[PDB]
């Protein structure tokens, strides 16, 4: 639907009420397929790398997350449809104005194209932005056709703060997902027994991000 109607009439309410919003059939089967093909070509270049952590303390990153990823701006040759995806997400966000909590969203990361090879690997329970690095909204587009979690696993399980029941999001094809990045939404990728693709972008809050960039260099002491 019109970015404006989806934003104001669905995304904004869902996000402020529950901190999670799912929009299925975001771009349609044709575009979704084109995106999937671009991701599979990118994977077939062999340029993917192990997913990394903000501050790794574990033996290896593989103990935490078991995916292979790359970062795309959306202007690279062969990624035009991923670019269309990123510009559509941006469209929705711009149309959310300052109605998504009290954040002033002025920027975002590049797209993280991610692949769980399907060998029983996933991502343990975690928070995307526990200690305030600017990330206020997580946006994930899934690409996996006829995915059956009872067979292939790979559920994204979110545990919204305070609620006694978690939520299981299947990584369905053409599904769009929004949720607060901070400690409100601890989540986990359960073991995936099949190749599981997803595209993520993190949107930033101006003030938080600006502070996050200075805290890295020094952080002073106390």
């Amino acid at each position: 639907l019109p970015a404006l109607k989806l934003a104001l009439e669905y995304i904004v309410p869902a996000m402020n009420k529950h901190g999670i919003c799912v929009v299925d059939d975001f771009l349609g089967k044709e575009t979704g397929q084109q995106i999937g093909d671009e991701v599979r070509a990118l994977h077939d270049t062999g340029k993917f790398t192990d997913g990394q952590l903000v501050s790794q303390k574990s033996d290896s990153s593989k103990d935490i997350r078991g995916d292979k990823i790359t970062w795309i701006e959306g202007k690279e040759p062969g990624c035009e449809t991923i670019g269309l995806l990123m510009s559509s997400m941006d469209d929705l966000i711009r149309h959310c104005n300052g109605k998504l909590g009290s954040y002033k969203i002025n920027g975002r990361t590049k797209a993280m194209v991610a692949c769980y090879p399907g060998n029983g690997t996933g991502y343990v329970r975690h928070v995307d932005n526990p200690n305030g690095d600017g990330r206020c909204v997580t946006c994930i587009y899934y690409l996996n056709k006829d995915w059956d979690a009872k067979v292939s696993g790979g559920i994204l399980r979110i545990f919204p703060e305070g609620k006694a029941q978690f939520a299981d999001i299947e990584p369905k094809f053409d599904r769009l997902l929004f949720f607060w990045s901070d400690r409100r939404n601890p989540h986990e990728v359960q073991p995936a027994y099949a190749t599981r693709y997803a595209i993520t972008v993190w949107y930033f809050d101006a003030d938080e991000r600006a502070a996050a960039k200075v805290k890295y260099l020094t952080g002073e002491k106390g």
């Binding site: 990394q52 952590l53 997350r65 969203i105 920027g107 932005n129 993190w202 930033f204």
Partner: peptide, 18 residues
Amino acid sequence: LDLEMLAPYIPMDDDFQL
């Protein structure tokens, strides 16, 4: 539970302005 060591990495540079 140290969340910092579990959080997915993002670059510090190369943000995209909206």
